[PDB]
């Protein structure tokens, strides 16, 4: 196997752009190497956090699956636009920071 890179790591999910207050918002992060190929090791260093309208930071937990996919879920309780940052080895993945619309 090879090492995953942040420039080619892909994140998908409705939680990347929309969240309902009180409801868990989920997203999936897929790690890839420098050549854009899929890596299957589940020991990558992936961290995430979300920043509310007041600048308060809150972590977003990650569950490392056996393959090269990582499930991330968060429950927003303050409405407004949120900023979701996903870091792999300290570097933002492709697309992060994400702008999340949190309603209700």
| Phi and psi at residue 14, to the nearest 5° | -70, -25
Which of 44, 35, 39, 26 has the alpha carbon at shortest distance from 91?
A: 44
Rounded-to-integer distance, Cα 48 and Cα 56, Å: 14
Give the burial class of 3: count Cβ atoms within 10 A of its Cβ; 0-12 exposed, 13-18 middle, 19 or more buried.
exposed
Rounded-to-integer distance, Cα 54 and Cα 93, Å: 24
Strand, coil or helix: what is 66? Answer: coil
Give the burial class of 35: count Cβ atoms within 10 A of its Cβ; 0-12 exposed, 13-18 middle, 19 or more buried.
exposed
Determined by X-ray
Rounded-to-integer distance, Cα 23 and Cα 58, Å: 16
Alpha carbon 81 to its chain's center: 16
Rounded-to-integer distance, Cα 72 and Cα 80, Å: 20
């Amino acid at each position: 196997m090879t090492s995953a890179t942040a420039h080619e790591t892909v994140a998908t999910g409705e939680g990347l752009r929309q969240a309902l207050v009180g409801q868990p918002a989920s997203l999936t992060v897929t790690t890839k190497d420098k050549d854009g190929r899929l890596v299957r090791t589940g020991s990558a260093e992936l961290r995430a956090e979300i920043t509310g309208p007041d600048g308060t930071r809150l972590p977003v937990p990650v569950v490392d699956h056996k393959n090269g996919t990582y499930e991330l879920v968060y429950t927003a309780r303050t409405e407004g636009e949120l900023l979701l940052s996903v870091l792999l080895y300290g570097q933002p993945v492709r697309g992060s920071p994400f702008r999340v619309r949190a309603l209700r």
